[PDB]
């Protein structure tokens with residue numbers, strides 16, 4: 345029942361209810377002639393909504409806000425970008441123009457600026473050291489260490505036992521490494537083990553791209569990362 349590319353036209357976003365007060369958003373974009381899905385998260389925060397990640401670009405993110413407005417009808421007051429890439433901060437200007445307070449760690453804000461990407465306005469302190477966690481309303485933000493990127497954060501919704509791994513966690517169907525240009529291949533397995541150690545009770549695990557699963561997605565990603573590391 346989870347939305348895949350065939351169900352999402354160009355420029356549109358679908359929402360998927362994972363648990364009470366927790367949804368994923370799914371959008372698509374083309375890269376080198378192939379179509380990729382991308383996931384973000386929506387977490388109910390009292391009578392407001394916390395958004396995790398843009399929908400990968402200004403068009404998709406405008407569609408994201410319209411679909412949230414249409415389907416949930418609660419204001420998106422804060423957004424957190426979980427790393428500096430365009431599927432996470434692309435669309436931050438649309439969020440900002442719509443009154444959403446956009447947040448990212450200083451590490452992500454720094455890397456986004458270097459890359460010429462959009463820059464969330466607010467800074468999330470307390471996340472610069474591997475193993476650091478901070479509460480952000482209905483979620484915990486966790487910096488597990490460098491993996492897919494040096495700044496990647498994961499998000500845990502304790503009320504629903506939902507772990508959102510972002511692009512540091514691969515879906516099961518991905519059996520070879522994706523974009524590792526900004527990755528720390530040497531530290532990625534150790535970072536995944538920090539996630540496993542902190543959230544062993546997680547019931548739902550959302551990769552940045554593709555189908556949700558359980559905690560097996562962590563070991564899966566480690567397997568794929570180690571196989572890529574040993575490419576000969």
Ligand SMILES: C[C@H](CS)C(=O)N1CCC[C@H]1C(=O)O
Nearest residue numbers: 375380429430431511522523
């Ligand atoms: C925009 C995302 C950020 S994790 C990305 O790097 N992608 C998504 C498509 C494949 C790969 C690439 O561009 O190389």
Ligand SMILES: [Zn+2]
Nearest residue numbers: 427429492511
């Ligand atoms: Zn990325």
Ligand SMILES: [Zn+2]
Nearest residue numbers: 431511552553
């Ligand atoms: Zn990604």
Ligand SMILES: [Zn+2]
Nearest residue numbers: 516563564567
């Ligand atoms: Zn696997």
